[PDB]
Amino acid sequence: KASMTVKINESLPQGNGKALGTVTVTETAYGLLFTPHLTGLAPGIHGFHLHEKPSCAPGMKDGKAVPALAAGGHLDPNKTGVHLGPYNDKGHLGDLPGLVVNADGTATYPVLAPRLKSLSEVKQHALMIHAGGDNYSDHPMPLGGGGARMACGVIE
Amino acid sequence: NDKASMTVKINESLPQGNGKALGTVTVTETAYGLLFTPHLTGLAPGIHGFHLHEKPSCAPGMKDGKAVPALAAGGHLDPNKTGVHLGPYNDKGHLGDLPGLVVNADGTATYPVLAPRLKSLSEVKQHALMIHAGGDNYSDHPMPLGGGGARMACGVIE
Numbered sequence: 001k002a003s004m005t006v007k008i009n010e011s012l013p014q015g016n017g018k019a020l021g022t023v024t025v026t027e028t029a030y031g032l033l034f035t036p037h038l039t040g041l042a043p044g045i046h047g048f049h050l051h052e053k054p055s056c057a058p059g060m061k062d063g064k065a066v067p068a069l070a071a072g073g074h075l076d077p078n079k080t081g082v083h084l085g086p087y088n089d090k091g092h093l094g095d096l097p098g099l100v101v102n103a104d105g106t107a108t109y110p111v112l113a114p115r116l117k118s119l120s121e122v123k124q125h126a127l128m129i130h131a132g133g134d135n136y137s138d139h140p141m142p143l144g145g146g147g148a149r150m151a152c153g154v155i156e
Numbered sequence: 157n158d159k160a161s162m163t164v165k166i167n168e169s170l171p172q173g174n175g176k177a178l179g180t181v182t183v184t185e186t187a188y189g190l191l192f193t194p195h196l197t198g199l200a201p202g203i204h205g206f207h208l209h210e211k212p213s214c215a216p217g218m219k220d221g222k223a224v225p226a227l228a229a230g231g232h233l234d235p236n237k238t239g240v241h242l243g244p245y246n247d248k249g250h251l252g253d254l255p256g257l258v259v260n261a262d263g264t265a266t267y268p269v270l271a272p273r274l275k276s277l278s279e280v281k282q283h284a285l286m287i288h289a290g291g292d293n294y295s296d297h298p299m300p301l302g303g304g305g306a307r308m309a310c311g312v313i314e
């Protein structure tokens with residue numbers, strides 16, 4: 001059973017917020033399954049992506065402090081330069097299905113990302129949770145409308 | 157680009173018979189299996205058992221003298237006769253096991269769910285797409301059939 005764990009922390013302008021729980025990443029016969037064990041999130045569907053750089057630190061953009069900016073953009077080994085979701089080979093390999101958050105603010109619903117096949121593809125990248133949702137497109141809003149980076153955890 | 161795709165209409169399952177139309181689910185073939193994109197409305201917020209049942213019917217059935225909603229659809233699609241409920245990501249259970257149907261706070265269903273084990277529309281035609289009152293933990297424990305419980309909405313895939 002090739003499975004591993006990722007600690008998730010709140011993402012503040014200053015650094016790291018409280019621990020919001022974990023996410024289990026498991027290899028299946030159909031791809032990587034992300035089983036969340038998170039708490040304290042806004043109910044609804046959240047942008048859920050793997051970002052390039054292994055960091056959840058703040059960065060500077062237009063003079064302001066931006067949560068988890070040091071993580072860079074989306075994991076994109078094919079250099080597609082386009083956000084197209086978990087089921088389309090023509091976009092960022094780091095595109096996972098939206099994270100489903102319950103009414104009590106927890107995340108327990110497992111999401112399969114069929115394109116990822118082994119834990120190695122996930123190591124040394126930032127697992128990102130956004131404020132906004134994800135329609136798996138750059139239209140109408142870029143990167144699925146995720147907007148701000150709200151929670152994060154370096155995988156390794 | 158291009159990939160085969162079809163549409164299924166969903167109705168309320170009442171003891172009496174069919175209820176309000178709730179919208180549709182688009183089933184599309186993808187490189188990674190069948191994708192079920194819902195366009196539904198008027199559902200209880202939360203996560204709902206979402207399975208394919210054996211018989212091409214959504215009609216009620218009689219069980220001990222009571223009309224049971226969508227009972228005429230039979231049990232879960234299980235060609236390999238596993239006789240067990242293990243979800244969308246496990247080969248050892250019902251082929252008809254899809255991921256839970258995610259319903260928003262407003263009662264709509266819009267979140268696409270991939271079922272990796274289904275590969276083509278032919279595996280899905282002439283079966284019932286079922287929506288339960290309860291959720292789905294992809295297991296027979298601690299409740300049978302993921303804890304889906306009552307059948308609350310249904311649609312026959314042509």
Ligand SMILES: [Zn+2]
Pocket residue numbers: 047048049050051074128130143146
């Ligand atoms: Zn992102």
Ligand SMILES: [Zn+2]
Pocket residue numbers: 049074082083084085092094095143
């Ligand atoms: Zn992306």
Ligand SMILES: [Zn+2]
Pocket residue numbers: 157158
């Ligand atoms: Zn075309």
Ligand SMILES: [Zn+2]
Pocket residue numbers: 205206207208209232286288301304
């Ligand atoms: Zn069922």
Ligand SMILES: [Zn+2]
Pocket residue numbers: 207232240241242243250252253301
């Ligand atoms: Zn089943």
Ligand SMILES: [Zn+2]
Pocket residue numbers: 278279280281282283
């Ligand atoms: Zn069949």
Ligand SMILES: [Zn+2]
Pocket residue numbers: 296297
């Ligand atoms: Zn048992």
